[PDB]
Amino acid sequence: LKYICAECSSKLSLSRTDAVRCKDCGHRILLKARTKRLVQFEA
Amino acid sequence: MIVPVRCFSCGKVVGDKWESYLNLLQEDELDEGTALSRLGLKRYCCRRMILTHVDLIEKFLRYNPLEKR
Amino acid sequence: WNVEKFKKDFEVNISSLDAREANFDLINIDTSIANAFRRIMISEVPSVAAEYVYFFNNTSVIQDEVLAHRIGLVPLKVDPDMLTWVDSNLPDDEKFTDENTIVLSLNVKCTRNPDAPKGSTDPKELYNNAHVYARDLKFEPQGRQSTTFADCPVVPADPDILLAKLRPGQEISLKAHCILGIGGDHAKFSPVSTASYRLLPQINILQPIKGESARRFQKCFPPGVIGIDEGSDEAYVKDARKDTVSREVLRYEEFADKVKLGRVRNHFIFNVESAGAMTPEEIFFKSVRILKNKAEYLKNCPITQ
Amino acid sequence: PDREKIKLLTQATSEDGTSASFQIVEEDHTLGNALRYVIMKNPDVEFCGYSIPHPSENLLNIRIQTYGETTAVDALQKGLKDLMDLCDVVESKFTEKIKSM
Amino acid sequence: RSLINPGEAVGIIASQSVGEPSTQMTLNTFANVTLGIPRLRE
Amino acid sequence: GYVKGRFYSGIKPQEYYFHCMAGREGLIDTAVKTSRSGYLQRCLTKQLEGVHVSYDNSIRDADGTLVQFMYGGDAIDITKESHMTQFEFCLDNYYALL
Amino acid sequence: MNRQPTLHKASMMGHKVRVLPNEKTLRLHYANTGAYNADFDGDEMNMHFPQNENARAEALNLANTDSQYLTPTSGSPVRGLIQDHISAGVWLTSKDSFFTREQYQQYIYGCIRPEDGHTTRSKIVTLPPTIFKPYPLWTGKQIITTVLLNVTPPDMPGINLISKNKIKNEYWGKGSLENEVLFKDGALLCGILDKSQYGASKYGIVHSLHEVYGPEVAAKVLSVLGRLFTNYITATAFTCGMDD
Amino acid sequence: TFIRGPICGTDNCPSRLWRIIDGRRTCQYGHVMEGDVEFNDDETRRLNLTTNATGSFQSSQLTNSQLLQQQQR
Amino acid sequence: TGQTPIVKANLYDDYGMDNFPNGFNAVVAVISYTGYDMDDAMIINKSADERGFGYGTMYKTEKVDLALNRNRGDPITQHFGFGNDEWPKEWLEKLDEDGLPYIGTYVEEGDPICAYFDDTLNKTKIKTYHSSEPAYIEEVNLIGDESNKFQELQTVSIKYRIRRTPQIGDKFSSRHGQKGVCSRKWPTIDMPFSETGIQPDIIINPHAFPSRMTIGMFVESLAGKAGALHGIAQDSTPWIFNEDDTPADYFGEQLAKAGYNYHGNEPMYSGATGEELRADIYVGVVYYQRLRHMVNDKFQVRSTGPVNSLTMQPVKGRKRHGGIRVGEMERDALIGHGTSFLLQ
Amino acid sequence: TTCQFLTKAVLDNEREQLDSPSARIVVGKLNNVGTGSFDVLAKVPN
Amino acid sequence: ETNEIGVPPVFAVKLTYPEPVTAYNIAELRQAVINGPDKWPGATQIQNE
Amino acid sequence: RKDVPKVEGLKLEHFATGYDAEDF
Ligand SMILES: [Mg+2]
Ligand SMILES: [Zn+2]
Ligand SMILES: [Zn+2]
Ligand SMILES: [Zn+2]
């Protein structure tokens, strides 16, 4: 899933015209979580 | 943050002795002086890396947003 | 001067030899050449260490570029004769083949252990895979490398190197592309812990010290440097190879005109330690055979205008 | 072969070619002080010394001035031969001490 | 040969040679005549 | 205020307080050196600024107003005057100056 | 170049460009840190660039760093070497410095380099050694002679000068004469070199070379002495301990 | 990365006059627009002006008229 | 990589400042050797810097907002997320499918940070990274409204993590006001090695001392080398020593039992030529600390660019590529040279 | 004080003659001190 | 030298100088246009007649 | 006033490069 709640740390996702809060606490700040990508670095 | 792999001045691989230092300092109950020379830190450039290290990663780990507290 | 006047006087004399360090003397050679061997072993002798790190996923608390850097300083046990030299000219279509590269991989997830004894503290038995060591790097053969490296596999030379620390929910997943390189481009390719020399110290006594003062003369040195021969009771040099020269006698007013302190100036006591890839005696042959090839390559280029 | 390793300079060369000064690329005190020691043992070289014109960029200048018995370049190439026979003594003296250890 | 050159700026050079040494003495006092810049301001 | 200590063996707690009292007096003293000797140069330079040597070796103003009849009395540059009355040096090195 | 605050007119000079690789800061020589009053801990300097040929000829012929050796305040020099180069000339022009044949020619060529810039001869000329027997050595006062022999034009004779320095005769021992500096036809015979000679002091050696040979050979000798006291330091370096 | 505009003030284009080659605007095939420079003001009564393009000022917040009211219903 | 000092005062423990480390115990040689370290400049060993010596990292937070200019009652005029018309499709390489960037990407000056699809202009718009420094992206937060619904994600907060490696021009200091600029990074083969193989990390000039008179920095190098060898930390509160018990007679005595020189000197060879140096030189372990004011926040270059509108002159910049100044004091210097063509 | 020297000069109808090096920076001529102190003519034949 | 300055390669790219084309520099202004704006020595603009 | 006390119980922590603790 996309996002993560701040207060209770439960994964969730949102849609268009959907409320921006968690569904177990109603906290109003969501961290966009990290997915799998291919960033290249030089060691 | 975490123990560095290579010593800065000489280049000796020193990043693996950290848990074996905190074992010899806890279990066998030595000082800091015979413990370091037991691991084979004979200079004083590589000797200060184990001796004066502050393991500040253990405070950074408690702030974890991937598990409900 | 001639080479036969060098071949007769030159004398190597090995003191000890291990798989991690080496101590051997070089008598009767110039300082412009004994220093030329020291600068080659540090700077220009090739070795293997991971140059590129491709991050699939990292949600740990150590950020990416530090973790990419901490992988680069791990000494792999790959013989560097076994690979070949990457060409930094081509794009990725012809850059990495099965003969340039070695592919390493690392995949660790960490989650809670429900068999935790109550009130315990140590995360060896409070979490599952909480300490990411260096032995968790897995060798991945690509191409003909399954037949080539079938005898000896790619192991890091010191496996307990701590790379990260994890807590539940977190995961590391990367790939590393180890190549060849000399120590003059980055300090992770230098296949040597340290490599120095020192001229042999020379203690000569002028006035024959005797009695209780000679007993007070011996203790201003390491034990074993200065001896006192019985009979004549005069202080004599057992060996000055153990001298750790510190000028302790010159602090005393009643010894400052009996001893001069000097060197031998052609007696280079080398001391070579290895970082983990190669044998210490194999590096010194590689430094001699590079200065021979640095001359022979210069001997055949034409001299333009 | 390579045309860009060593090149003789024209602003500092005599007509008959008994005093010339080169410029080697990708060298330092590693070769430059080891080349300067074995050239000066040749008894026709009046003057020899290196100088690195800047430590940032990577060049190395050698100067050779002889008396007239030979050229500068023949004085250079006799040292490069004698350096190659000097590394071969140490390597041949080192296998003997490793094996007989 | 040690003469002045025509067209030179001696008006500027006179001002930057009274002012610029006067930076090295700024009111850092210990007959009784006025010293330093407050003499030079008068 | 007499401090009989030195910086090699260290000073006493009372002498440390007197020495910081005089060390601060230097830092405020530097804090006036910036702006006060800067208006002095501006008043001079704005007024002169055009006072140039003419081709008669006089020192004219910009609008033709005469100020001096020669530069300082002898038409001598200060940057070329240093070895003008060092007479023994011109004698000992006569041929190189010829 | 320019450095705020610009007090006197010799703080806006005109330099020739030398384009270096692999850095991000402007690089400056120590001889210009008398004019800008610069200290290398975070000082920032501007740099301008004239665009026509009129204002290009005037930053080379009127405002350059060669033409400004003496301020018009009183006439004293404001251009000369600093801290490590004054503590090296004391140790190199001392009586106790003896170089063999290899170390003599290495210090000469490492500073002079005839394949570019200034060497008014064609070859590199040397001097016969001081001690001839049993081991031919040179002295450190022949290195300053050989440097002044190659940068001076050949069709003018040497320089003659008697002067002093800041170290009295009592510090060396009895009967010494190392406080008197004597140049006889461009050859140092007596005395050691100090801040009074090749620093920013009046009536030294580089002030006299400015006055006999003109400004273009004054600011060449200042550069060549910069590199002789740099590579000499890198072989016989100079510390300052606790026991001092 | 471009910005549409005129063709060019010369016959030597068509283009969409791309953005800023530092200081002035440029066409695709090279020709720097001659001549105008990007303005900026580095430092009351609030007005309805929306200066965005190259530091020059634009008009009020009425768009093409009926489309905001046909699509709203 | 923070480190705790060896020579610490006793209020380092009772105030708890080992929780926030400031510096790193460097191995400092007091020597004039390179000729690049005169006038308050220092030399860092290159092959100690490339093992992470004083590696730093600067974070920086920008709040991407579109709830402004909204006139207190209007509908949600623009939304996050991708549209349905054409958009150049290399935006998808760096933006996720809701108009927010992928966590951990590598942004340069020109890459997008959010793609908000407008409605009153019917176009898939964009917002771009403005600063010229290549940064990553560490965290993105979705801030919701504290008031009622309004729920089309009007406020987002992005945090960029910027790498700061020790360059040439980066100020360092000791604990004694010896503030200096790193002037070159010296290769480790050219550094003066010791008789045990320890090349230094930082070479500082000996000419810095006798005008500043920092004799604390001479005793700190003895108490670090004596403290590293026997593995003890040293007390260095003021006013525990006096005239009779000086620290150089105390910290020198611990050095003599360890087999070193009583005055803190070491016999050290040269790196270029290979010969032994003349004097035994003076090394130690001095707790440094890395200053801010990196060189990357300082430089500035202009050829032609954005001007002012009233006077057609360049702007006051470093963020707008604006010219420097030629003041009223640099105008009076250009006349005094006699150059009236550099004045025009 | 700029208005004071301005109001005296307008009431006098004073022609400025552009001689000071601060007046030639306002108008934008070449200065008089130094290299702007003469004229350079060319010598064309025929 | 004493009369020099070390310009780093971030200033040696943005600073230009209008050097006109005559017969003696056409050998060098061709090599300086081909090098482009991001290789020193290069050039970053032309200007027609 | 009491002296800053001696740290007691020390031994040689620096040997020649090729020699060790047990040789001495
Ligand atoms: Mg400063
Ligand atoms: Zn929640
Ligand atoms: Zn070490
Ligand atoms: Zn166009």
**In J1-46, alpha helices (H):** 2-12, 23-27
Nearest-neighbour CA in chain C from I51: distance (Å): 7
**In B1-69, alpha helices (H):** 18-24, 33-38, 47-51, 57-60
Asked if C170's CB is within 8 angstroms of B66's CB, the reply is: yes
Say which of C222, C223, C269 has its CB closest to residue L18. C269
Domains of chain C are 1-46+188-305 (3.30.1360.10), 47-187 (2.170.120.12)
Q: How far apart are CA G239 and CA H15, in angstroms?
A: 68
Report the length, in residues, of chain B: 69
Exposed e or buried b per residue across I89-104, where buried means at least 16 C-beta atoms within 10 angstroms of its C-beta: eeeeebbbebbbbbbb
- In one letter, which amino acid is E28? N
Say which of D12, D48, D50 has its CB closest to residue G115. D12
- In one letter, which amino acid is F50? G
J35 touches chain G (CB under 8 A): yes
Provide φ and ψ at F63, rounded to 5°.
Answer: -90, 20
Region label for G214, one of left (φ > 0), alpha (ψ between -120 and 50) or beta (otherwise): left
Ligand 3: centre distance to CA C152 (Å): 30
CA dihedral defined by I39, I41, I45, I50, rounded to 10 degrees? -160
Q: Strand C102-109 vs strand C111-112: parallel, antiparallel, or unpaired?
A: unpaired
Which residues, at least 6 apart from B62, have a Cβ–Cβ distance to it below 8 Å?
none
Q: How far apart are CA J30 and CA C42, in angstroms?
A: 62
Which of I175, I223, I183, I224 has the alpha carbon at shortest distance from I202? I183
- Mutation site, B48, B55, B57, B59, interface I, largest I CB count within 10 A: B48
Helix (H, G, I), strand (E, B) or coil at H58: coil
End-to-end CA distance of chain G: 41
Nominal resolution (angstroms)? 3.5
Chains that touch H (3 or more CB pairs under 8 A): I
Q: At what angle do helices D29-39 and G101-112 cross, to 10 degrees?
A: 130
Which of I282, I265, I233 has the alpha carbon at shortest distance from I25? I233
Q: Which residues of J touch E11 (CB under 8 A)?
A: 33
| Residue limits of CATH 2.40.40.20 in chain G | 1-68
- Mutation site, A5, A20, A35, interface I, largest I CB count within 10 A: A20
Which residues, at least 6 apart from C91, have a Cβ–Cβ distance to it below 8 Å?
none
K10 touches chain I (CB under 8 A): yes
Tokens representing L13 are 């922590």
Distance of CA F90 to the CA centre of its chain: 28
Ligand 2: centre distance to CA C170 (Å): 20
Provide φ and ψ at B57, rounded to 5°.
Answer: -75, -25
Asked if B66's CB is within 8 angstroms of A8's CB, the reply is: no
Q: Is the peptide bond before G5 cis (omega within 30 degrees of 0)?
A: yes
Tally of domains within chain A? 1
**Domain spanning G69-239: CATH 3.40.50.1220:** no
Task: Return the half-sphere exposure (C-beta side, CA atoms, 13 A cut-off) of residue C156.
Answer: 26
Asked if B65's CB is within 8 angstroms of A31's CB, the reply is: yes
Region label for B44, one of left (φ > 0), alpha (ψ between -120 and 50) or beta (otherwise): alpha
Ligand 2: centre distance to CA A29 (Å): 9
Ligand 4: centre distance to CA H53 (Å): 19
For A17, counting Cβ atoms within 10 Å of its Cβ (0-12 exposed, 13-18 middle, 19+ buried), the class is: exposed
The answer to whether I278 touches I19, Cβ cutoff 8 Å, is no
End-to-end CA distance of chain J: 56
Distance of CA B6 to the CA centre of its chain: 12
- Alpha carbon distances (Å) from G150 to G75, G209, H3, I202, I204: 29, 14, 64, 37, 34
Helix (H, G, I), strand (E, B) or coil at B33: helix
Say which of D73, D83, D89 has its CB closest to residue C295. D83
Helix (H, G, I), strand (E, B) or coil at C237: strand
Dmax (CA) for chain C in angstroms is: 82
Asked if A31's CB is within 8 angstroms of I142's CB, the reply is: yes
For G123, counting Cβ atoms within 10 Å of its Cβ (0-12 exposed, 13-18 middle, 19+ buried), the class is: middle
Helix (H, G, I), strand (E, B) or coil at C145: helix
- Alpha carbon distances (Å) from I273 to C30, C200, I194: 11, 18, 14
End-to-end CA distance of chain D: 42
- In one letter, which amino acid is C258? K
End-to-end CA distance of chain H: 35
I99 touches chain B (CB under 8 A): no
| Residue limits of CATH 1.10.274.100 in chain G | 69-239
Tally of domains within chain B? 1
End-to-end CA distance of chain I: 53
Residue by residue, DSSP assigns D6-67 as EEEEEEEE-SSSSEEEEEEES--HHHHHHHHHHHTTSTTEEEEEEE-S-SSS-EEEEEEEE-
Tokens representing I185 are 């990074």
- In one letter, which amino acid is C21? E
The answer to whether H60 touches H49, Cβ cutoff 8 Å, is yes
- In one letter, which amino acid is C184? G
Q: How far apart are CA A31 and CA G205, in angstroms?
A: 73
Q: How far apart are CA I292 and CA I170, in angstroms?
A: 8
Q: How far apart are CA G102 and CA D34, in angstroms?
A: 13
**Count of C-beta atoms within a 10 Å radius of residue K21:** 11
Domain CATH number, residue D87: 3.30.1360.10
End-to-end CA distance of chain B: 24
Structure letter (DSSP) for residue G33: G
Q: At what angle do helices D72-99 and C280-298 cross, to 10 degrees?
A: 160
Which of A26, C110, I61 has the alpha carbon at shortest distance from B66? C110
Q: How far apart are CA D50 and CA G110, in angstroms?
A: 7
For G175, counting Cβ atoms within 10 Å of its Cβ (0-12 exposed, 13-18 middle, 19+ buried), the class is: exposed
Partners of C23 in beta bridges: C16, C271
Q: Strand C259-274 vs strand C21-27: parallel, antiparallel, or unpaired?
A: antiparallel
Q: Position of tokens 């191409």? A: C143
Helix (H, G, I), strand (E, B) or coil at G140: coil
**Count of C-beta atoms within a 10 Å radius of residue F39:** 11
- Alpha carbon distances (Å) from G200 to D64, G218, G231, J37: 37, 13, 22, 34
Exposed e or buried b per residue across G4-16, where buried means at least 16 C-beta atoms within 10 angstroms of its C-beta: bebbbbbbbbbbe
Asked if F82's CB is within 8 angstroms of G202's CB, the reply is: yes
Which of C273, I271, I260 has the alpha carbon at shortest distance from B11? C273
Which residues, at least 6 apart from C223, have a Cβ–Cβ distance to it below 8 Å?
L24
Exposed e or buried b per residue across B9-44, where buried means at least 16 C-beta atoms within 10 angstroms of its C-beta: bbbbbbbbbbeebeebeeeeeeeebebbeebebbbb
Asked if E20's CB is within 8 angstroms of G8's CB, the reply is: yes
Provide φ and ψ at I158, rounded to 5°.
Answer: -105, 140
Helix (H, G, I), strand (E, B) or coil at G244: coil
Nearest-neighbour CA in chain F from J38: distance (Å): 10
Size of interface E-I (CB pairs under 8 A): 14
Residue range(s) defining the domain that contains residue D74 = 1-101
Exposed e or buried b per residue across C48-85, where buried means at least 16 C-beta atoms within 10 angstroms of its C-beta: bbbbbbbbbbbbbbbbbbbbbbbbbbbbbbbebeebee
A17 touches chain I (CB under 8 A): yes
Provide φ and ψ at F44, rounded to 5°.
Answer: -65, -50
Report the length, in residues, of chain J: 46
Nearest-neighbour CA in chain B from C262: distance (Å): 24
Domain CATH number, residue B37: 1.10.10.60
Which residues, at least 6 apart from I344, have a Cβ–Cβ distance to it below 8 Å?
G55, J30, J31
Provide φ and ψ at D99, rounded to 5°.
Answer: -70, -45
**Sign of CA pseudo-dihedral I182, I188, I192, I195:** positive
Which residues, at least 6 apart from H40, have a Cβ–Cβ distance to it below 8 Å?
H55, I306, I307, I308, I309, I315, I320
Q: How far apart are CA I259 and CA I108, in angstroms?
A: 55
Nearest CA in chain L to C198: L17
The answer to whether I219 touches I248, Cβ cutoff 8 Å, is yes
Q: Which residues of D touch G108 (CB under 8 A)?
A: 49
CATH architecture for segment(s) G1-68? Beta Barrel (2.40)
- In one letter, which amino acid is I42? M
CA dihedral defined by I293, I296, I297, I301, rounded to 10 degrees? 140
Residue by residue, DSSP assigns E1-42 as --BPPTT-BHHHHHHTTTTTGGGG--S--------SHHHHT-
Q: Is the peptide bond before I192 cis (omega within 30 degrees of 0)?
A: no
Asked if L7's CB is within 8 angstroms of I232's CB, the reply is: yes
L13 touches chain B (CB under 8 A): yes
Residue range(s) defining the domain that contains residue B23 = 1-69
> Which helix (H) or strand (E) is C212 found in, with range?
helix C212-218
Helix (H, G, I), strand (E, B) or coil at B2: coil
Tokens representing C80 are 């560097």
The answer to whether I59 touches I324, Cβ cutoff 8 Å, is no
Tally of domains within chain D? 1
Residue A7 annotated in ligand binding: no
- Angle at B11 (CA atoms; ends B7, B15), nearest 5 degrees: 45
The answer to whether B18 touches B56, Cβ cutoff 8 Å, is no
Strands (E), chain H: none
Asked if I303's CB is within 8 angstroms of K14's CB, the reply is: yes
Query: Percent helix, strand, coil in chain H (nearest 5)?
Result: 5, 5, 90
